[PDB]
Amino acid sequence: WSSTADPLSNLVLTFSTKEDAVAFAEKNGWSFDVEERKVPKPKSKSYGANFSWNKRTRVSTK
Amino acid sequence: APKKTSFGSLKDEDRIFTNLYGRHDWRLKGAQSRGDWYKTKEILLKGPDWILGEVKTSGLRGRGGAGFPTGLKWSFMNKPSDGRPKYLVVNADEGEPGTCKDREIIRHDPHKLVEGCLVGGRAMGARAAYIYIRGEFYNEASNLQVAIREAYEAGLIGKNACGSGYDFDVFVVRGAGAYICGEETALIESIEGKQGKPRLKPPFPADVGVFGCPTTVANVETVAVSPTICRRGGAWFASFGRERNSGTKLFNISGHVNHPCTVEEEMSVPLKELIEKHAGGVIGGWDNLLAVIPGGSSTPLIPKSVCETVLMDFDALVQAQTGLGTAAVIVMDRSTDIVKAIARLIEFYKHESCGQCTPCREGVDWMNKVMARFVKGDARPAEIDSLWEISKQIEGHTICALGDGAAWPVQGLIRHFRPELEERMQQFALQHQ
Amino acid sequence: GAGGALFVHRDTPENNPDTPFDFTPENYKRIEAIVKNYPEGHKAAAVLPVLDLAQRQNGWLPISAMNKVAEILQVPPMRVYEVATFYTMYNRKPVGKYHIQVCTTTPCMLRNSDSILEAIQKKLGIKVGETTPDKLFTLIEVECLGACVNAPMVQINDNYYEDLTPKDIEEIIDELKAGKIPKPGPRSGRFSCEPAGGLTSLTEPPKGPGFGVQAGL
Ligand SMILES: NC(=O)C1=CN([C@@H]2O[C@H](COP(=O)(O)OP(=O)(O)OC[C@H]3O[C@@H](n4cnc5c(N)ncnc54)[C@H](O)[C@@H]3O)[C@@H](O)[C@H]2O)C=CC1
Ligand SMILES: Cc1cc2nc3c(=O)[nH]c(=O)nc-3n(C[C@H](O)[C@H](O)[C@H](O)COP(=O)(O)O)c2cc1C
Numbered sequence A: 001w002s003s004t005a006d007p008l009s010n011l012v013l014t015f016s017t018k019e020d021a022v023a024f025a026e027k028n029g030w031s032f033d034v035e036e037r038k039v040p041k042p043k044s045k046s047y048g049a050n051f052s053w054n055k056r057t058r059v060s061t062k
Numbered sequence B: 001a002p003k004k005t006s007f008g009s010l011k012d013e014d015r016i017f018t019n020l021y022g023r024h025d026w027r028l029k030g031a032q033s034r035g036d037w038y039k040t041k042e043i044l045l046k047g048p049d050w051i052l053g054e055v056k057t058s059g060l061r062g063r064g065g066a067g068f069p070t071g072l073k074w075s076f077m078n079k080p081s082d083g084r085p086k087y088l089v090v091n092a093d094e095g096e097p098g099t100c101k102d103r104e105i106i107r108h109d110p111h112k113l114v115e116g117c118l119v120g121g122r123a124m125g126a127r128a129a130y131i132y133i134r135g136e137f138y139n140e141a142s143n144l145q146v147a148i149r150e151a152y153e154a155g156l157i158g159k160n161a162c163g164s165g166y167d168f169d170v171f172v173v174r175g176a177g178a179y180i181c182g183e184e185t186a187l188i189e190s191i192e193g194k195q196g197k198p199r200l201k202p203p204f205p206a207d208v209g210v211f212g213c214p215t216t217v218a219n220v221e222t223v224a225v226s227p228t229i230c231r232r233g234g235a236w237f238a239s240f241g242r243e244r245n246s247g248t249k250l251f252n253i254s255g256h257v258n259h260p261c262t263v264e265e266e267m268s269v270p271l272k273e274l275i276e277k278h279a280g281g282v283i284g285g286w287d288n289l290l291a292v293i294p295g296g297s298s299t300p301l302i303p304k305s306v307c308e309t310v311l312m313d314f315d316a317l318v319q320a321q322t323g324l325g326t327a328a329v330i331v332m333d334r335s336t337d338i339v340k341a342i343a344r345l346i347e348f349y350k351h352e353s354c355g356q357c358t359p360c361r362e363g364v365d366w367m368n369k370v371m372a373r374f375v376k377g378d379a380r381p382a383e384i385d386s387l388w389e390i391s392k393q394i395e396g397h398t399i400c401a402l403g404d405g406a407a408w409p410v411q412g413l414i415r416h417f418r419p420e421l422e423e424r425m426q427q428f429a430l431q432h433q
Numbered sequence C: 001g002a003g004g005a006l007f008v009h010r011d012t013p014e015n016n017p018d019t020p021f022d023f024t025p026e027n028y029k030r031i032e033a034i035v036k037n038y039p040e041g042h043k044a045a046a047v048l049p050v051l052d053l054a055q056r057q058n059g060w061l062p063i064s065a066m067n068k069v070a071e072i073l074q075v076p077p078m079r080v081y082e083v084a085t086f087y088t089m090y091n092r093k094p095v096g097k098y099h100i101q102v103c104t105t106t107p108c109m110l111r112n113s114d115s116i117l118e119a120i121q122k123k124l125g126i127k128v129g130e131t132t133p134d135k136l137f138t139l140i141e142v143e144c145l146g147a148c149v150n151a152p153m154v155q156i157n158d159n160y161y162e163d164l165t166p167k168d169i170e171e172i173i174d175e176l177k178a179g180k181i182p183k184p185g186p187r188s189g190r191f192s193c194e195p196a197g198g199l200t201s202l203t204e205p206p207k208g209p210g211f212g213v214q215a216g217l
């Protein structure tokens, strides 16, 4: 079996905002690394572009 | 006096398709003699606005089956040029079971279609006309090409097309056995060398069509009448049929009739008069009639109770819960298996789905299996309502209107012939237990 | 019922990428004429006709024919494979010299299309998917051919034969076997889409050029 000696190997905490997480870690005395939230960028979609008269976007199949 | 009430007796002086039977020469010399290619230059010189107005005044509705008003639809390409060429596509697929009007127009009056292409392209500002014809219509396509050749030689199309100053080309592209390619967007895709799979709308073809250019898709019958409407006027064309149901119409009467045929008739003719006059009535008498599909397989069937008093136009048949469709009357007498006919239509639709979208691709095959079990009686009554709901899920949830045409005949059969289904199930249970 | 034809390709000694296929020079002239119709930069639009042209020279479409069309039009071969498997008029297997297609849809079935199908089967000794051992005939059933008024009807190598009874289709088969070609059209003294007797309309002479023209034109 898989053995461990780490008592915190399973602990996961959930926070509303990064500030709450940072405050919790600071008051508990843990060194922390924060990563900014990554969101998908807004993309311009257009169905008609699939059938461009002169553009490269035209689909070869559908 | 205006507002006629008894439509359905018009003489040959008011029929557009005078060579419907092909008795007369189908060649250009014959076309000209009948009244074709007359004052084309004058019509072209009147301009697109004048041409568009004539279509609008006539009230002409699309003869391909949907009945969308033709003038408004054609006016969608009246925009100024944006650098892209403009095209007119003629829908000559004619895949609807029970329908043979476009075949006759193509084989026996091709110059009417060529002139209609020229006038429609002038109205839309189009550059050339692509005529997408059924692949199985080899001889019809060859006659069409001969007609286009003799029109090119006589200077009726091509460069300047007339003493007009307008350049117009007419191309014939043949399909390869696909009923779905009758749909306008699927037709456009098949012209561009792809599978005949319909597009989503928007965009509409007037914005992004064939080769990505503004396009207008029109039914063969819709285009052929275009020059006769221009010459005689929209007011004359309108003087036939009820309000919002103007003009004449080709009807294909087939099935259990004494003389199956095709005939031009006024729009709002009653169904009974049309069947008993031109088709020779139902074999076994009018009281032998069981059901009628008034507009090709895509329309729900109606029983004899409705058939005796319904008019053959868009709004009248909509009020009868069926629809005019392609004006392809299929008659079934009291001697046929009404469930088997609908099952065969559902099998046709299962074999004709393109498979692109989920509701059609899965549910039409599902409905085919259910209907094949219904024919034998394998099912239970609780499935009939179930089948109804399956159709409802399919209808209005698909890209293409083939799903509607698959779900409507089943709804018609269930709406009007449920007791036959239930007694078939009871019989199968009785001799099987 | 189910289609029966497979939509995968497995190489065979008679159908592999090295099966000999090439267009005739006349077919190359026809290909150039077909290509010219479409707008420049949209050459693919010729996949549908040119593929058909290949089948009109070879009889069917071997995988090498699809590869040749794809290379000639500079289209990826999978696009030509899609086109070939989508459309039902393309023959991805060899067929007989005469391809009999009988319509069995509802308007055509209501006028006793099964009688025609059984007559063909008993005349040829083959079923609705098979090819005669002489490799002359192949019988299949098809959906609506657009000749419903003339039902029951049959389509043979671009010729419609309509208003058929068992005897007419049997004698058409006899005429096709003995090395003759039969005249297409109705087989009941109709030769049109007209009513079978009487000609209810279009009896009067057609009007002349300009008869109904409106004022100011
Ligand atoms: N001739 C034949 O053999 C066959 C005929 N049909 C008929 O096709 C009918 C349904 O087909 P659909 O194409 O779905 O009709 P549809 O309801 O989608 O519209 C028909 C025409 O009006 C145009 N249109 C509609 N709304 C528009 C808008 N807001 N803007 C611009 N253009 C617009 C469409 O582009 C199309 O050209 C059926 O009723 C059927 O009877 C079906 C199969 C075969
Ligand atoms: C599955 C399907 C098949 C169709 N087949 C045809 C056809 O063969 N011929 C035709 O004129 N219209 C056909 N239509 C309807 C076309 O959308 C119609 O022709 C197009 O909208 C322009 O027709 P119109 O001139 O009557 O307005 C079909 C529609 C669907 C959904």
Ligand code: SF4
Residues within 6 Å of the ligand: B180, B197, B198, B352, B353, B354, B355, B356, B357, B358, B360, B361, B398, B399, B400, B401, B402, B403
């Ligand atoms: S409804 Fe049927 S034919 Fe139309 S796009 Fe969907 S799957 Fe294809």
Ligand code: FES
Residues within 6 Å of the ligand: B097, B098, B099, C103, C104, C105, C106, C107, C108, C109, C143, C144, C145, C146, C147, C148, C149, C151, C153
């Ligand atoms: S149903 Fe047979 S040709 Fe139409």
